[PDB]
Ligand binder design. Structure first.
Ligand SMILES: O=C(NO)c1cccc(C(=O)NO)c1
Ligand code: NA
Ligand code: NI
Ligand code: NI
Ligand code: NI
Ligand code: NI
Ligand code: NI
Ligand code: NI
Ligand code: NI
Ligand code: NI
Ligand code: NI
Ligand code: NI
Ligand code: NI
Lengths: 174, 174, 174, 174, 174, 174
């Protein structure tokens, strides 16, 4: 039955929100995984570790914000298993940043579709929500991961252990 | 003829804005009536009274900024009578909360139609204005009014005079 | 059913307070209309606009204190339509000052009749309420508007656009 | 191979830790779900929502500290799917508290087994890690949940909606 | 080649940002020119000069944020000559204000066309970027220049040198 | 005809100043281009980017000071097109530094000629202006650009991607 607050909220929108929530939780799990990889005693890049833990916590916020949205519009929250990440070993700082970059473009793609749907269903409140809270966040995150990938490459990563050490100190360590 | 500032601002949009101003002033008036209803010596719920007086002054502000937008775009303000509310006696705390929820959804619907007009006339400025200053304010009012209605019901209102009293104290009073 | 608080409160008085409520709300509306007339890109006198918006919120307070009075004596508030103002275009700073003067003398005339009624019904609390919160406010307001009208006339308004500009800057702007 | 730091760390412990990590993430997920149940417009108990959201974030911390422990001892983290919680709809404040109480005792169960493993493998660093950061935390949580359940039942929950409202305000609302 | 960050960014959009970049710099150049026209000893209106120098620096910021956008989305900046302004002598305060109004309406028109392109290529990030940072800024700037034009005209500009002097003091000089 | 302030100010000097204004605007433009080159996701050297953006805003100040000197002496400002820079793509940190040095030596050459023109025309006011505000600024910039080029070379640039990264961090990052 229909929530007392529901208005102009398409059940397709509601289902897409539930999928986005699962995708943000998944992204935060991937970042959690990347963070404790660089915490390993045989990798030991503390700033990669805390860079990725920070992203892990932001993705958890992203998801909670979609959960609040769902309830605000009178949709109903249906959670699904959070799939484990594709890797347990992320190989290098470089490779981790690249996998993060790919992850973010896939999150961005699902959000752009969410936005298209909201536009298509004449749900301007939801479109504006995706614009305000998610779209520029992806663009900034993707632009930053590219910069990082670019620098690690020009420095000689992953072959230069020096390059990853120094990028950990001078870029990811403030 | 036309204002020196007018640009990409359709006369249909100008008319809808004059319509929305009136509806916002109307909403203010309803909330004013509600507020002083709970100020009656035979109703005597100060925090209900305070809550709707606050929404009354908010709606007045909603109206004033639509008047500002009107002049900004070079449209022209035509005011209309402000219609008296549907009731002089709002019956109870629960009933007033329910009428308020109904009122906001009707205002929300008016705003969503205004937004699709702005997008049909390819007026991205007007569309963003509505997104930015109205759409999420309506979603929040509607979700809050929903929450209040739910709690007042679960508590035993409107039959239970104890329920409305305790809601007035513990939810609407800080 | 007579209110448990009602005492020495005549229904003529009760009815006349409801009329005065409506009249203050009307005065508020007129002032609102004048304010955004001067916000127009082709009128553009910011301190005229500010001045009348201030008067508008004052009149709203005037109306709210009368609704409070009604409930304090155990009368019952009945709201009526709020008529739109007489003009959509107010022509000039001078002309709006003069309509304000005339509006304020009309509200004063109604308040003097309200007070006459309270005294004829031996209602000294009501007469003192009107004396304390309304009569000198009107006299001050009428005196200020006449001062403003007088200076605008001597400066050459409304034919001198220079005059209305300089008045807006030096008298209505701090 | 074998990590340069590994010392007295049995592969059964390492694998028991990996399973605990998953169980803490699971517990986090359950609490997240409970939290936004109470945020629904038709449930609308915001301090229940606040309380479970805070437990959710605490369990994510339990999980991260185990991931740290694993790396400290030279184990290797292997994450698994995080299973979706057993309900989408938690029925009431009282039922949520009872479910949470059941969840915490099960987590307590797995930790005391984790701990008896550590004593048996003569891993005293691991046993005190469990003693110090988990065992008393679980006892406090189980006791607090017991107290809440006890109080909700005496107040008349889950049938008395008044009871859950007042418990939300006077216990969970600080 | 395609940038590693590019996603949902159409080459027409990329091309149109490059044009908008050039147009803002052009606008900044026009304002620079207007500003030092009022610095001339035979014009000598220092608040006119400060007013246009300020808009000049704002327009340069408009251009720089567009260059930032281009790189954020993976586009490539291509700069073009900056055309000199249409006049070397701007004639009067009023005439400069009117040229500024027409300039800002042209930049607005190009910005609306940029936004419609973003909408048509389903590029919600770019459209939101234009909504957020440019469209209301244009509307405010157009509205203000219109106000200034109106006040200069009512005061007797540009024949009244007294008028432009008094307007420079009381409106543009804080 | 002649400005009422003009004195000992040769028409050739007035024209040379108009030329120098353009060249300063040109220098500004080159540095702006360089700046956002290093802001590209595939270049990604923020301190290079910030460094040239700073020089860009300084050149703009250099230009405006000359526009002010022009009016101070009763000459008349004539703006010309600002020519786009010679490159859209500046290749590397070392190459941009070398271009910048070349640009500055060319600007210095223009200024030294402007100075000798001033001394040939017996304009001690113009000659001291160039001395006081440009000549040593040019020498300091040329010396500093020289120092940067030397270090990037000794470090292994532009081959070494590590070189430019470490320089960006330790020299241009304070
Ligand atoms: O310490 C123990 N319980 O407290 C314990 C448990 C299992 C085995 C052994 C053992 O091998 N003793 O020799 C000891
Ligand atoms: Na928007
Ligand atoms: Ni995200
Ligand atoms: Ni409203
Ligand atoms: Ni209480
Ligand atoms: Ni009044
Ligand atoms: Ni008498
Ligand atoms: Ni735990
Ligand atoms: Ni033992
Ligand atoms: Ni601009
Ligand atoms: Ni569309
Ligand atoms: Ni220079
Ligand atoms: Ni270093």
């Amino acid at each position: 039955s229909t929530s007392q607050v529901r208005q102009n909220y398409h059940q397709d929108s509601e289902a897409a929100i539930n999928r986005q929530i699962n995708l943000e939780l998944y992204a935060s799990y991937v970042y959690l995984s990347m963070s404790y990889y660089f915490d390993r005693d045989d990798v030991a890049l503390k700033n990669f570790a805390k860079y990725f833990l920070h992203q892990s916590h932001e993705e958890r916020e992203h998801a909670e914000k979609l959960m609040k949205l769902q309830n605000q519009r009178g949709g109903r929250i249906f959670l699904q298993d959070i799939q484990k990440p594709d890797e347990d070993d992320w190989e290098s700082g470089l490779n981790a940043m690249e996998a993060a970059l790919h992850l973010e473009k896939n999150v961005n793609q699902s959000l752009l579709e969410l936005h298209k749907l909201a536009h298509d269903k004449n749900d301007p409140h939801l479109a504006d929500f995706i614009e305000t809270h998610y779209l520029n966040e992806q663009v900034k995150a993707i632009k930053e991961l590219g910069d990082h990938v670019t620098n690690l490459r020009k420095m000689g990563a992953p072959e230069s252990g020096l390059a990853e050490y120094l990028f950990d100190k001078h870029t990811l360590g403030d």
